[PDB]
Design a protein around this nucleic acid. Structure first.
Length: 309
DNA sequence: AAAATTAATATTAAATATTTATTATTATATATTATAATAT
């Protein structure tokens, strides 16, 4: 029972990007040709395979959702391409982790749909039917320059707009059956943390709060009562984050810090911090990073009235 | 003297197919080495 819009117009969250890719879909449909290669990158976990399946039903063809471990050997991908047909498409994931032998096999596969292979050297030339190679990675920066320059469509995925996050909150609460408020929708959009999954988790938890504290009612006051104590903040801070900030600023006064020293002093190993708490705050930019220590920026000083050295 | 020939004549005995320590050689994090700026 996962959250999934049925259609591309039904897909809501990136309206300009949705219109762009709808234009690409109608370009594939009208031209009666396989759609160009689409590069996809952005958030790591977003259910991209399901969206590729939706694109498959929009094309009406089959897309083999494949990844790096699936296509780590060139033989497996060659076999899948041989079972691929005209007008079909192949979802590819973890292209960055894939071996360069895969890259050289996929050079002629998209280069006008051919295949060249060596056998005292003898050359064997093979052909491939036209198709839509789909390349989606968590990060596209590791893609090699000739390969990415030879591609066609490049599409970016990102967390939704705050008003559009609020609309997604409203739709998911209607799916979940929660009697949510537009003020509460904007509240959870401010709490969306850039992640739809943790957003839906917050909808579930405020639904539980409205069930056990209110009379099944989600309002702005109910949402504030649910999300203004413990690891919460209107911007996205936690009391873990506030503790980290306070412990950095009382010790080193916004100066260079030792990461092992921080892990020892906080009674909290630095690994989880740099895995969840630090990357979000640096995603907001609020911590500036040095090779001699992580320091918060002027935003955190303005949060607590602190000076600037 | 000095090497080649041959008839007795005592002598010797037939074990393969498998198997496990005993050597090769192939990754994989992880406690090392390292640099850069930085106060004092």
């Amino acid at each position: 029972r996962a959250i999934r819009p049925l259609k591309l117009a039904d897909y809501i969250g990136q309206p300009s990007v949705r219109e762009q890719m709808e234009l690409f879909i109608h370009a594939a449909r009208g031209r009666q040709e396989a759609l160009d290669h689409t590069l996809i990158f952005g958030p790591p976990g977003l259910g991209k395979t399901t969206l590729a399946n939706i694109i498959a039903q929009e094309m009406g063809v089959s897309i083999k959702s494949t990844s790096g471990p699936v296509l780590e050997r060139p033989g497996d991908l060659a076999a899948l391409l041989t079972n691929l047909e005209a007008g079909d498409v192949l979802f590819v994931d973890e292209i960055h982790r894939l071996s360069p032998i895969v890259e050289e096999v996929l050079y002629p596969a998209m280069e006008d749909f051919q295949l060249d292979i060596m056998i005292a050297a003898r050359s064997i030339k093979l052909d491939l039917p036209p198709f839509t190679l789909v390349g989606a990675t968590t990060r596209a920066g590791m893609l090699t320059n000739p390969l990415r320059d030879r591609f066609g469509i490049v599409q970016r995925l990102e967390f939704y707009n705050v008003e559009d996050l609020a609309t997604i909150v409203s739709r998911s609460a209607g799916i979940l059956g929660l009697e949510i408020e537009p003020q509460g929708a904007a509240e959870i959009a401010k709490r969306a943390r850039g992640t739809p999954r943790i957003a839906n988790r917050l909808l579930r938890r405020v639904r539980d709060f409205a069930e056990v504290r209110g009379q099944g009612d989600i309002t702005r006051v109910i949402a504030d009562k649910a999300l203004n104590l413990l690891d919460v903040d209107e911007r996205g801070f936690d009391h873990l984050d506030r503790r980290l900030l306070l412990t950095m600023i009382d010790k080193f006064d916004g100066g260079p810090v030792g990461i092992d020293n921080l892990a020892a002093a906080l009674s909290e190993e630095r690994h989880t911090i740099e895995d969840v708490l630090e990357p979000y705050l640096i995603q907001q930019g609020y911590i500036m990073r040095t090779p001699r220590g992580r320091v918060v920026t002027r935003h955190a000083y303005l949060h607590f009235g602190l000076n600037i050295p």
